């Protein structure tokens with residue numbers, strides 16, 4: 001089983017594709033509660049995930065992934081094993097002491113990037129979204145009221161909103177009108193570069 | 194608290210919008226395990242949902258909703274209560290003996306329909322999808338290989354795939370190329386008209 005890091009040129013369009021990884025196998029990583037890195041065991045966090053993406057050859061690969069808590073500093077490519085000793089992933093993304101476990105995970109977004117853009121945001125708890133912006137509900141409501149009369153044009157930009165209680169994806173046309181929204185009912189964080 | 198059925202002309206763009214319902218309140222229906230209809234109690238099904246949508250004024254309102262199991266025949270608009278006696282929803286969609294509980298639910302899709310289409314499919318367990326079609330994995334892989342060289346155009350059609358283990362939404366351009374995919378990691382059924 002082989003795992004190649006996108007950050008080091010490892011994308012291969014004929015292999016399984018996950019955020020940060022091209023692999024010869026497709027592991028369902030939702031099932032693990034404990035993993036091992038350099039013979040140290042780490043617990044998977046319950047009920048909170050990490051929204052991770054890689055962008056390679058004009059292809060966006062994004063998903064909500066399990067994460068484990070680790071006070072050691074780990075680096076891209078470090079092999080991640082199950083407790084039986086099999087390698088199941090590699091280190092890819094981190095948020096402080098949380099490390100993503102990349103593989104088949106929770107909700108996902110795959111997208112052809114040619115002709116569009118995509119942006120990621122931390123969603124403040126209690127805020128509302130319209131289109132490309134977040135703000136207080138009453139501010140957003142006023143914005144939505146103004147944009148209601150516009151005729152919807154083609155999607156040109158994607159906005160990913162990652163919150164403690166909900167995640168969502170919005171899309172806009174060139175005039176800023178919201179065209180489509182999807183909501184994922186899970187809480188998560190974004191990686192910190 | 195008022196609940197108006199979209200099937201009977203009840204859409205109101207200034208009220209909370211859920212599949213089949215415009216309401217003066219926004220109830221989180223994920224929390225209920227038991228509901229009441231005409232003073233009979235019904236259990237909510239665990240770990241399996243119903244993908245429901247209404248299409249009103251060129252607006253698509255779709256979501257994965259809890260469902261309860263009921264051997265009585267119920268009709269659109271029948272009031273659904275919590276066990277404290279408060280009305281929390283109305284009957285909207287059914288799949289045999291399953292009835293959707295519409296409100297704030299699980300994963301959702303909101304979409305402006307002007308200029309695009311949308312279609313719903315039962316996803317056969319074990320099948321793969323590309324674009325507007327499902328089939329056996331090796332058939333779909335051959336299709337994807339043919340379409341790989343095409344340049345992505347604007348989204349014109351949405352396809353909703355509802356399976357026992359996963360739900361997904363794909364989008365295509367006028368040439369049938371897949372532009373974007375979202376996956377929801379929950380199992381569900383579609384309503385039966």
Ligand SMILES: Nc1ncnc2c1ncn2[C@@H]1O[C@@H]2COP(=O)(O)O[C@@H]3[C@H](F)[C@@H](COP(=O)(O)O[C@H]2[C@H]1F)C[C@H]3n1cnc2c(=O)[nH]cnc21
Nearest residue numbers: 015016017018026104318319320321322330331358359376
């Ligand atoms: N070589 C093969 N690889 C994979 N599946 C294969 C293969 N041969 C046959 N099949 C069958 O085909 C269907 C379609 O699966 P599909 O790839 O559409 O997506 C699936 C589903 F959303 C979910 C469970 O699906 P499952 O119930 O297992 O059904 C499968 C399976 F029965 C996991 C997800 N998933 C799989 N791989 C990747 C990946 O690389 N990236 C991102 N997500 C991935």
Ligand SMILES: Nc1ncnc2c1ncn2[C@@H]1O[C@@H]2COP(=O)(O)O[C@@H]3[C@H](F)[C@@H](COP(=O)(O)O[C@H]2[C@H]1F)C[C@H]3n1cnc2c(=O)[nH]cnc21
Nearest residue numbers: 125126127128129137138165166183208209210211219297
């Ligand atoms: N009058 C108000 N109504 C609603 N929220 C209000 C209001 N005033 C202030 N707020 C705050 O604003 C944010 C943005 O919520 P938003 O509407 O974006 O979507 C939310 C989230 F995805 C999820 C939990 O969000 P929550 O943590 O409660 O945060 C809220 C809240 F703090 C439920 C979902 N949801 C709410 N209503 C509907 C609806 O009618 N249809 C479909 N989904 C709906």
